[PDB]
Amino acid sequence: GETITLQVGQCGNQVGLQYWQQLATEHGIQSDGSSTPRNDHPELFFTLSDSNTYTPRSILIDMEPSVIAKSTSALPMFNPRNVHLWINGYKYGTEEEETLLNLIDREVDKCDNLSNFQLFHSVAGGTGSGVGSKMLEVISDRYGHKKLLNTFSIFPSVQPYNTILTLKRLIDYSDATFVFHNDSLNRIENGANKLIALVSASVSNPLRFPGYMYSSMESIVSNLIPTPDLKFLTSSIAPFSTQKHNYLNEYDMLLELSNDRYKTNRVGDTSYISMLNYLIGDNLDQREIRKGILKSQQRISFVPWVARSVLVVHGKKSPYLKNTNLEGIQVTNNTSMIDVFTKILKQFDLLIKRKAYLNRYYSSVEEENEVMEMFNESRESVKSIIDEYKACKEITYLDDD
Amino acid sequence: GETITLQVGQCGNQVGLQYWQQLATEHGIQSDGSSTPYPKDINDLQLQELGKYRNDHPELFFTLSDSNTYTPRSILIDMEPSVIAKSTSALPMFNPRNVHLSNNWINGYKYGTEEEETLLNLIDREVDKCDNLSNFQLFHSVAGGTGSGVGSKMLEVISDRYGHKKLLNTFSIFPSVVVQPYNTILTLKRLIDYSDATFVFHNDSLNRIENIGANKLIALVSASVSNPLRFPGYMYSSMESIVSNLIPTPDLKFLTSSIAPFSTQKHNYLNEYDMLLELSNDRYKTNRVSGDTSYISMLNYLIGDNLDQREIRKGILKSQQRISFVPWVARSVLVVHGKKSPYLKNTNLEGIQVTNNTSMIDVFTKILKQFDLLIKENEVMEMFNESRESVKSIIDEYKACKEI
Amino acid sequence: KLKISVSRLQKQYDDIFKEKIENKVGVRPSVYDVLKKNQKLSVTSESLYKVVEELMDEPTITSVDLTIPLPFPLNLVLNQQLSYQYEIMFKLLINIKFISKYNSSNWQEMNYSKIWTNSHFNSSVKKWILRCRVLHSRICSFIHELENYIVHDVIEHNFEEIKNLIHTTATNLATSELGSDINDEGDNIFNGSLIRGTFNNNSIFDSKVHKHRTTTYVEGISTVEQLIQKFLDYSSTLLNDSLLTREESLRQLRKMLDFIFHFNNYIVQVKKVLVLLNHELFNEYSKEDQESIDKRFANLSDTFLMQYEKFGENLVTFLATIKQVGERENQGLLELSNRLELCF
Amino acid sequence: VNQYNVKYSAILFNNHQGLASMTTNEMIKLIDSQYNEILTFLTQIIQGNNKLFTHVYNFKRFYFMETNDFIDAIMVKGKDVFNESSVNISSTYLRKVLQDAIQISSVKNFEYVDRLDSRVLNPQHGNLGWESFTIEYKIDDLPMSYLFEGHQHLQYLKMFHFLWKLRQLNNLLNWHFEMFNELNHNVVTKLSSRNRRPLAKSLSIITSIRFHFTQFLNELIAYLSYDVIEENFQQHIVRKLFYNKNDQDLLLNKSFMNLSEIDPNNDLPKFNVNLLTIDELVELHGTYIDSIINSSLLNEKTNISYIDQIFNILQTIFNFINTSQEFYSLVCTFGLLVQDQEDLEFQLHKIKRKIYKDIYQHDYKRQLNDLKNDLNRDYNLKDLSKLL
């Protein structure tokens, strides 16, 4: 089925520009939307006119026109009709609810069979994070739960308040949320949006370049989310490619994809809940992959109550990329989320006991009570998810004792 | 049949000039009246190695002279000569004989009454050139001065001089000053009494569409309504047949039109299926319509070469469920497969939707409220009372339309 | 099978597969263009588990088949025996694909449907839901592992050899002229060659020698007989590797697929029951007693436990069967046994 | 033909000594060359000078009702001639009607306006003009007329008859609308306020019933025109002639053989259209007509056919029109009056009751419900059932 991309905020718009440039390069679509000389299926991400032009399905949302202007000028094939221009931002989103609801309904009507909503946004984006938090609520309300949502939220490197307020709605409404940290991205680079764009583009490779299996997003996601509570994913990318000293075999890709240094978020000891590895090359040797799967299963520490299966998808490289060597992406579901969530909660508590900057949000007695109850609910939800991820680790998870 | 166009008032003349230039462009008739040779048909395939003949009906509007010169069937009525001078200069094809030259509605109405014989002679002269006349088209503004009074008097004169044996449309433009509400109600009284089908255009909603001039949109809608007549197809091809499909009773005669703006921007509609869904949007209707509206009749125009039947069928099926039909009217959506003029180089589709919904309750309510506020020889006050009662006579009727 | 109109599936398949855009006269059609319109998908009375038993209602998926008539002479190489072995694989793969599509949709509801995602359940129902979600996750992972083995470890891996061989043969023939010249001498042997009579003694040598040694597929396929034989061997490999050739493997596979399908149906019927348990949503759904609620939960306890233990039994038997068959005959099944054992 | 005779006699009798003195390979090659040349010239005539596609398009334009303006002109001009019995109509009146309708409509600029000709088929006493008039497109001046056997033309006149009835009713409803709308302004709105309200209500009821009937007829015509006639034309004529008839023999690329030579010569054109035999042309046009006449809705297959139900609804509409004329006369007699008032009011109530209850509620809604339920049993007609 078709997918709709939502871009919110300055960071979201920049990441989306890189993402769409990568996708258009992979499908050979020119900057003006004209084709270049089919077995691939860009229709899932591009709308095809009866004049042979490809335009992205994405929707651009931002508080200021400079970022949107840069993005549109860089890629002229964006449709201008889809362009629209913390608590203050969220209340502003309430005012524009009708316009945005109709704007999204236009894209849904334009496609034939909708599958999922992609969202590119930054949790630490301030006002834009507020408008994206409202976007999740309105979409989930109007379209129910038949269509799932995927959020490629960028985590932060007064900010604690914003991170908690955005994470409350991220937990409530998102169906499968990727976690990216600028710290680990710049550590890997030792710009940064080119890693997120690459990971997001590769995550959907089996859909755009069909093969024997994994033809739908339901199959890709369902392998990684045993419970709707544990919805945060850790993504790992192998950087050593296109150099002379590349990984010599896909088997070494499978073994060295699990290194903790390549993960896109700060990690000690972790337990894996689910696994799925992407291998993308013109030709793939099966016996190497079998040996690598066996070693990966014998090496990785799974939680007791999970089936303990490692899945390797055999992605196909784009014809428009000339004979490049193998590359691969790893997406995992770990219990390492407790560390980052604990860090966020510690910062939030430290800055909530001290009334440092709450004057910018508490306007009156009723506003004080409103913000206090909202903050308490967000804190309780985050603690609930931490406790759930902690109870997953132990062996008595399925016991009623 | 034949159609006679009458333009009254400055706004009416401004709209009519572009309406006639649009028609002349579609039919390949130059501004001097000279005709252009007809290009070969596109779907009339022919074997291949590897002048007066036509298949349209332009003469339904233009009088074809013995010297192969076309001339519109238009009559221009107003008092200020500047607009008429501009219109004639832009289009020399207009017949000078057809031009007639001379704020309070009463003054204009009395002027029309005193000089009714000359205008009537002009109408009869235009009719005499027509064999098997079909209908009259009126372009006038409900409020604005000359247009209101003169158009109302011409409405009455035409209605009673021919025994109402031919239907009479009305492309009225509603206003977006102390005298304006009086003029609006006074003209709407005669619109109720005499007009057979009224196309309500609201200037504020036209400005809302534009910012995404205002007369160009009116000209486009008016010149696209009659597309089946000028390019005959399987269905309709008669002005009475189109109107009769949207007017269930004489009272529910007020129609409103929706326009798809993006006929030229390179991000135009992908296909017919997309445009069928986009036409129902309330942001491009020419009359402000709320969410409590209900539709009495549906009619969609499609203008393009070799439209895909699968897309149209699927679009009709999807759009039928979305539309909220009045309980006592069967769910029916009709699509007109118009033919694009071969003279036009643009290959993009255009589509105009004409609807008969119940949103008129709010519009006439606003007009009535403004009139009531402003009210707070004696003959004129009696006419005001009569107009108030006549307007209420269809206010309550459109309200009752909701009920089985 | 009988509770649905057969003629509708044909049309709903042709809209997907054999859609067309025409081309002008003189423009050559592609071979894919020619073979698209040939194919026909029809429902047959012979179910998969019955038709495969011969060459040792149920839901319609068990009985939907696909046939492709072929032009002359292409049908001589794609002999009917080869197409029949292809059709069996089509039926098996459609069964597994359908179950995977039933495992994804049920996973969408189990996680995000309002009734399941409701927070206002009591602790007991919460733990019951958690157990059910974990069990369904195990079933999903098992099915994806089985499908991965069948499709990548059996079909693609074997097909690589044929693809390489056929490419080599195409390149070999591209440079080869059509028609070969044969020359001969005057053959003056006459009486030195007639050897008239009953016969010579050379007949014993012809029988003594053997010609069972042919390998290395040098310079690609050189005889049409080998061309047909390669594909027949490929189809036989596909059937043998898949768990359809032995009786133990086929029986275990049939039990496993039946159990998974019935579990999905039971999951669907569960959605109705959960409405009555919690109150916050029962009032909303009823718009259109403690003892009774306790009875409902007690019934669900035993039903869910039965499904859980049945899954364990089927898994144990299936692994044992694969292990014995892989150790005896098939190399491909042995590594699958190792992988599944390392899973659970 | 003479040039061809000389050319190929110079091969049979000069290059060789007859068919007997020819090896089988050369004889087959000669016959193949003759076949290609002959069919090339047959195309260059039939689809060339004769313009087969243009005349088939005109057949579809006129017989299948496409130029609705011309037929509206005929019906408005002949609204009095067709009223009398089929025996009374003479040739001169038909010619006058046809010429007036040609001048009024847009066919006067049509290229082949001369070929048009009207006729009456069966001048029976019991048949009115509407039940016998048929428009005939003369193609006798071309050799193409010998390919098109009379059976095809008879099936072209049957389908025209059905479509003619439908459009006759569609236009009668327009005249009904105009006359009642004019009467509303002339009588009802000027009547005394005491009895204006009941008459206004009755008139509104009548006009709403007319609107319902018009919607039904328009949907039926739209379905036929843009799903049966147009789809069949584009699928069986345009796609057979101009697009490639891809076949299993066209699949084989013979250029794997060296085949450096080409025959008969570069002088023989390639013609952008499939080379069809005479029997192939006859079969092509026969199948194109048969598909339309024997469509799903128009086939003869409640143990009743769809055509019978449609015709029953059409008879309902005819009865409605005939009774509405009586209502027209009674209300205009009510207008003229302003003890007779009570009698006229009673008759008005009786007529309104008859039309509202019997014709609409008792007959039309019941028949339409049965027809809608019948259509849902068919996959093809389910979509039409939802609208119609």
Q: How far apart are CA D378 and CA B60, in angstroms?
A: 43
Query: How many whole angstroms from its chain centre is CA B53?
Result: 30
Q: How far apart are CA D19 and CA D22, in angstroms?
A: 5
Q: Which structure tokens are listed for D7?
A: 């050319």
Q: Report chain breaks in chain A, C–N > 2.5 Å, as residues after which they occur.
A: 37, 85, 157, 190, 267
Q: How far apart are CA C109 and CA D265, in angstroms?
A: 71
Q: Report chain breaks in chain D, C–N > 2.5 Å, as residues after which they occur.
A: 301, 338
Q: How far apart are CA D215 and CA D203, in angstroms?
A: 19
Whether the CB-CB separation of A48 and A54 falls below 8 Å is answered with yes
Whether the CB-CB separation of A400 and C127 falls below 8 Å is answered with yes
Whether the CB-CB separation of D53 and B48 falls below 8 Å is answered with no
> Contacts for C336-342 with beta carbons within 8 Å, 24 or more apart?
C336/C149, C336/C153, C338/A294, C339/A293, C339/A294, C339/A297, C339/C145, C339/C149, C340/C145, C342/A294, C342/A297, C342/A298, C342/A308
Which residues on chain A place their C-beta less than 8 Å from a C-beta of chain B? 47-50, 53, 55, 79-81, 102, 106, 109-110
For residue C41, what are the β-bridge partners?
A: C66
Closest by Cα among D349, D354, D348 to D333: D348
Across the interface, of A81, A102, A110, the residue whose CB is closest to B274 is A110
Q: How far apart are CA B15 and CA B216, in angstroms?
A: 7
Q: Which structure tokens are listed for A175?
A: 């169906």
Phi-psi category of residue A117: left, alpha or beta, with phi > 0 → left and psi -120 to 50 → alpha: beta
CB pairs < 8 Å spanning C and D:
41
Q: How far apart are CA D380 and CA D227, in angstroms?
A: 11
Residue given tokens 């693809």 in the structure block: C163
Q: Which structure tokens are listed for C72?
A: 């002359």
Q: Which structure tokens are listed for D32?
A: 């193949």
Q: Which structure tokens are listed for B212?
A: 């995404």
Q: What is the 3-state secondary structure (H, E, C) of chain B?
A: CEEEEEEEHHHHHHHHHHHHHHHHHHCCCCCCCECCCCCCCCCCCCCCCCCCCCCCCHHHCEEECCCCEEEECEEEEECCHHHHHHHHHHCCCCCHHHEEECCCHHHHHHHHHHCHHHHHHHHHHHHHCCCCEEEEEEECECCCCHHHHHHHHHHHHHHHHCCCCCEEEECCEECCCCCHHHHHHHHHHHHHHHCCEEEEEEHHHHHHHHCCCHHHHHHHHHHHHCHHHHCCCCCCCCHHHHHHCCCCCCCCCEEEEEECCCCCCCCCCCCHHHHHHHHCCCCCECCCCCCCCCEEEEEEEEECCCCCHHHHHHHHHHHHHHCCECCCCCCCCCEEEECCCCCCCCCCCECEEEEEECCHHHHHHHHHHHHHHHHCCCHHHHHHHHHHHHHHHHHHHHHHCCCC
What is the amino acid identity at position A161?
A: Y
Widest pairwise Cα distance in chain A: 68
Whether the CB-CB separation of B163 and B194 falls below 8 Å is answered with no
**Sign of the Cα pseudo-torsion (B82, B84, B87, B88, in order):** negative
Residue given tokens 């597994």 in the structure block: C96
Q: How far apart are CA A131 and CA A85, in angstroms?
A: 11
CA within 13 Å, CB half, D40: 16
Q: How far apart are CA D176 and CA A211, in angstroms?
A: 64
Whether the CB-CB separation of A390 and A271 falls below 8 Å is answered with no
Query: How close does chain C come to D379, measured CA to CA in Å?
Result: 8
What is the amino acid identity at position B374?
A: L
Whether the CB-CB separation of D174 and B241 falls below 8 Å is answered with yes
Q: How far apart are CA D198 and CA D206, in angstroms?
A: 12
Closest by Cα among B387, B6, B3, B163 to D181: B163
Residue given tokens 């099978």 in the structure block: C1
Please state the φ and ψ torsions of residue B136, each to the nearest 5 degrees: -110, 145
Question: Which residue of C116, C137, C139, C154 is the best one to mutate when testing the A interface, meaning the one whose CB has the most A CBs within 10 A?
Answer: C137
DSSP class of residue A122 equals: B
Residue given tokens 């406790």 in the structure block: A387
Neighbours of D (≥3 Cβ pairs closer than 8 A)?
Answer: B, C
Identify the H or E element spanning A152.
strand A148-155
Please state the φ and ψ torsions of residue D58, each to the nearest 5 degrees: -65, -35
Whether the CB-CB separation of D89 and D70 falls below 8 Å is answered with no
Indicate the SS3 state at residue D348. Answer: helix
Neighbours of A (≥3 Cβ pairs closer than 8 A)?
Answer: B, C
Q: Which residues contact C31 (CB under 8 A, 6 or more apart)?
A: D251
Closest by Cα among B47, C29, C32, C30 to D244: C29
CB contact under 8 A, D274 and C178: no
Q: How far apart are CA B89 and CA B93, in angstroms?
A: 9
Contacts of D203 in chain B (CB under 8 A): 249-250
Q: What is the 3-state secondary structure (H, E, C) of C231-274?
A: HHHHHHHHHHHCCCCCHHHHHHHHHHHHHHHHHHHHHHHHHHHH
* Alpha-carbon dihedral angle through residues C287, C289, C293, C294, given to the nearest 10 degrees: 170
Query: How many whole angstroms from its chain centre is CA D16?
Result: 56
Q: How far apart are CA C56 and CA C48, in angstroms?
A: 12
Closest by Cα among D157, D154, D152, D158 to D284: D152
Q: Which structure tokens are listed for C100?
A: 């995977």
The pairing of beta strand B352-357 with beta strand B295-303: antiparallel
Q: How far apart are CA B1 and CA B165, in angstroms?
A: 13
* Angle subtended at Cα D373 by Cα D368 and Cα D379, rounded to the nearest 5 degrees: 125
CA distances from A251 to A254, A296, B124, D221 (A): 5, 10, 94, 67
Identify the H or E element spanning A6.
strand A2-8
Q: Which residues contact A194 (CB under 8 A, 6 or more apart)?
A: A18
Whether the CB-CB separation of B275 and B300 falls below 8 Å is answered with no
> What is the number of residues in chain B?
404
DSSP string computed for D108-160: GG-TTGGGEEEEES---TT-BGGGTEEEEE--TTSTHHHHS-HHHHHHHHHHH
Identify the H or E element spanning A2.
strand A2-8
CA distances from C19 to A275, A335, B272 (A): 38, 48, 19
> What is the number of residues in chain A?
401
Q: How far apart are CA D351 and CA D347, in angstroms?
A: 6
Q: How far apart are CA A371 and CA D6, in angstroms?
A: 105
Q: Which residues contact C297 (CB under 8 A, 6 or more apart)?
A: C124, C125, C128, C277
Whether the CB-CB separation of D228 and D292 falls below 8 Å is answered with yes
Q: How far apart are the first and last CA of chain C?
A: 36
Q: How far apart are CA B290 and CA D197, in angstroms?
A: 31
Across the interface, of A49, A80, A81, the residue whose CB is closest to B270 is A49
CB atoms near residue B118 (< 10 Å): 10
DSSP class of residue D10 equals: I
Strands (DSSP E) contained in A188-252 are: 232-237
Please state the φ and ψ torsions of residue A55, each to the nearest 5 degrees: -125, 140
CB pairs < 8 Å spanning A and C:
92
What is the amino acid identity at position A158?
A: V
DSSP string computed for D169-188: HHHHHHHHHHHHHHHHHHTG
> Contacts for A139-142 with beta carbons within 8 Å, 24 or more apart?
A139/A104, A139/A173, A140/A173, A142/A101, A142/A105
Chain B contact present for D279, CB below 8 A: no
Q: How far apart are CA A148 and CA A116, in angstroms?
A: 5
Closest by Cα among C125, C109, C105, C107 to C117: C109
CB neighbour burial string for D367-388, b if at least 16 within 10 angstroms, e if fewer:
bbeebeebbeeeeebebbeebb
Whether the CB-CB separation of A21 and A128 falls below 8 Å is answered with no
Residue D240: exposure state from Cβ atoms within 10 A (0-12, 13-18, ≥19): middle
Residue A42 preceded by cis peptide, ω within 30: no
Identify the H or E element spanning A272.
strand A272-280
Across the interface, of C112, C127, C145, the residue whose CB is closest to A148 is C112
Q: Which residues contact B28 (CB under 8 A, 6 or more apart)?
A: B35, B36, B38, B341, B343
For residue A278, what are the β-bridge partners?
A: A313, A329
CB atoms near residue C169 (< 10 Å): 17
Q: How far apart are the first and last CA of chain D?
A: 57
Residue of D nearest to B159 (CA): D185
Q: Which structure tokens are listed for D138?
A: 């003369």
Q: Which residues contact A36 (CB under 8 A, 6 or more apart)?
A: A28, A29, A30, A320
Query: How close does chain B come to A79, measured CA to CA in Å?
Result: 6
Contacts of A80 in chain B (CB under 8 A): 267
Please state the φ and ψ torsions of residue D143, each to the nearest 5 degrees: -65, -15
Closest by Cα among A398, B101, B53 to C126: A398
Q: Which structure tokens are listed for D193?
A: 């306020």
Query: How close does chain C come to D272, measured CA to CA in Å?
Result: 6
Across the interface, of A213, A218, A294, the residue whose CB is closest to C148 is A213
* Angle subtended at Cα B13 by Cα B9 and Cα B14, rounded to the nearest 5 degrees: 115
Residue D145: exposure state from Cβ atoms within 10 A (0-12, 13-18, ≥19): middle
Indicate the SS3 state at residue A301. Answer: coil
Q: Which residues contact D17 (CB under 8 A, 6 or more apart)?
A: none
Closest by Cα among A80, B334, A342 to D387: B334
Whether the CB-CB separation of C318 and C252 falls below 8 Å is answered with yes
Indicate the SS3 state at residue A277. Answer: strand
Contacts of C22 in chain D (CB under 8 A): 239, 243-244
Q: How far apart are CA B306 and CA D279, in angstroms?
A: 31
